[PDB]
Design a protein around this nucleic acid. Structure first.
Ligand SMILES: O=c1nc[nH]c2c1ncn2[C@H]1C[C@H](O)[C@@H](COP(=O)(O)OP(=O)(O)OP(=O)(O)O)O1
Ligand SMILES: [Ca+2]
Ligand SMILES: [Ca+2]
Length: 426
DNA sequence: ATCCTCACACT
DNA sequence: AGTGTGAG
């Protein structure tokens, strides 16, 4: 079981929110620019950064005022605000554009607002039969890198890419319709078409990874950005993983990746191969150890889920520091703002996707607590009605109020969160 | 004071 | 049902 059964692609829009504003505002194209939300505090937090601005070291999470110190000619687009909070509608809608184009080629899994996995196994099969037995020309792959090539016995980047592609296509066994390397190559030709279709029909540029599973696809995608795709073959994995830091593989970027590194005394993904599956399972659990055992050999079976629609519709606002909501009527007003956006997006969903949400999830944070949420509670969602939702949300969080007064809210609320979930066909 | 999101595992 | 992790 070499884990070469499937062809999987991960497509990822290049600096997506920036492109969305650059498409709409041509003055911003091919310039250092970023997208920010909320202008008042330190110029606004940066959530997306064009590749021109990145070369000055501008990053996400920075304050816009500080980014202007790194890049004085940085241009800024501010996220729409509605009802006193950020409104992402323009980007969800531009996201819909991209998901619908990709869905014309294969079944996709929406992984985030701007990336989708594609299972190309079947599409590659059909294309292999229409392809008689004729060779794959390099012109079919004008923006594809083959990771690990060129090797063996040109100083500029496009030169390297071409030499690597040529070495790869020279040794392609195009007479064997079951060689896994042929299938990825044909998968990559389809992804070139997918990416040309996206750019022509939206103007949005993107990168893609093509491999045999989701984690290699995602890893491959970020090896050659922007506006390029990378094929990571099963055979490339030992050299690729030998110096790949663990935290770079999807889901090892957090506490678990930190435990793998610490407990085992290792640094790179390839070092995991020296351990038995029983050993990995003993340190990290049955499923995490089985998964680590196979993943460090480049094998993973997580399937491409057929799901293009989010499972939850959510809507939240932080109230940091001195702004924490300390009165009962303050908490009521913002729950109404939240419910009002929620209601408007839910009714778009019902009309667009023939489904209804049946459960309302209310979360709050409390000043003094350490974590994202401090409490989560749930009631029934029977009506796309902003007042009822916010009345029901208040009902189910009223007793969190440690205050003895009735008009006050102690401890003050630092976050409000409303989430419709548990959708059913309608 | 990166804010606002979404999926999923664990219990 | 509620919590926590990991990601965009
Ligand atoms: O913390 C965040 N808070 C609010 N919004 C965020 C956040 N993190 C990412 N986002 C939004 C904007 C980003 O454009 C889009 C895709 O995210 P993401 O793929 O990670 O980065 P990106 O498309 O901007 O650049 P790139 O893929 O070329 O590295 O998600
Ligand atoms: Ca992405
Ligand atoms: Ca992206």
């Amino acid at each position: 079981a070499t884990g070469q059964d499937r062809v999987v692609a991960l497509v990822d829009m290049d600096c997506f929110f920036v492109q969305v504003e650059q498409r709409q505002n041509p003055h911003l194209r091919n310039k250092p620019c970023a997208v920010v939300q909320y202008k008042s505090w330190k110029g606004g937090g940066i959530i997306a950064v064009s590749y021109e601005a990145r070369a000055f070291g501008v990053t996400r999470s920075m304050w816009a005022d500080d980014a202007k110190k790194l890049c004085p000619d940085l241009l800024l687009a501010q996220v729409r605000e509605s009802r006193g909070k950020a409104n992402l509608t323009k980007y969800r809608e531009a996201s819909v554009e991209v998901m619908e184009i990709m869905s014309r080629f294969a079944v996709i899994e929406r992984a985030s607002i701007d990336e989708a996995y594609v299972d190309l196994t079947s599409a590659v099969q059909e294309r292999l039969q229409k392809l008689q037995g004729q060779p794959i020309s390099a012109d079919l792959l004008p923006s594809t890198y083959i990771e690990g090539l060129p090797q063996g016995p040109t100083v500029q980047k496009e030169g390297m890419r071409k030499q690597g592609l040529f070495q790869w296509l020279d040794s392609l066994q195009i007479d064997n319709l079951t060689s896994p390397d042929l299938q990825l190559t044909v998968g990559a030709v389809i992804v070139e078409e997918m990416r040309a279709a996206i750019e022509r029909e939206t103007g949005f540029q993107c990168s893609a990874g093509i491999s045999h599973n989701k984690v290699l696809a995602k890893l491959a995608c970020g090896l050659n950005k922007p506006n390029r795709q990378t094929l990571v073959s099963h055979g490339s994995v030992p050299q690729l993983f030998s110096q790949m830091p663990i935290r770079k593989i999807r889901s090892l970027g957090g506490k678990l990746g930190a435990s793998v590194i610490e407990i085992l005394g290792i640094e790179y993904m390839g070092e995991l191969t020296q351990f038995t599956e029983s050993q990995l399972q003993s340190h990290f659990g049955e499923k995490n150890g089985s998964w680590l055992y196979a993943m460090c050999r480049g094998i993973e079976h997580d399937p491409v889920k057929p799901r293009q629609l989010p499972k939850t519709i959510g809507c939240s606002k932080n109230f940091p520091g001195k702004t924490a909501l300390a009165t009962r009527e303050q908490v009521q007003w913002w729950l109404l703002q939240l419910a009002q956006e929620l209601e408007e997006r839910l009714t778009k969903d019902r009309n667009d996707n023939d489904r209804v949400a049946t459960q309302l999830v209310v979360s709050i944070r409390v000043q003094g607590d350490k974590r994202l949420s401090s409490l989560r509670r749930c009631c029934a969602l029977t009506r796309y009605d902003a007042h009822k939702m916010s009345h029901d949300a208040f009902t189910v969080i009223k007793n969190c109020n440690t205050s003895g007064i009735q008009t006050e809210w102690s401890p003050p609320l630092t976050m409000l969160f409303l989430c419709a979930t548990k959708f059913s066909a309608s």
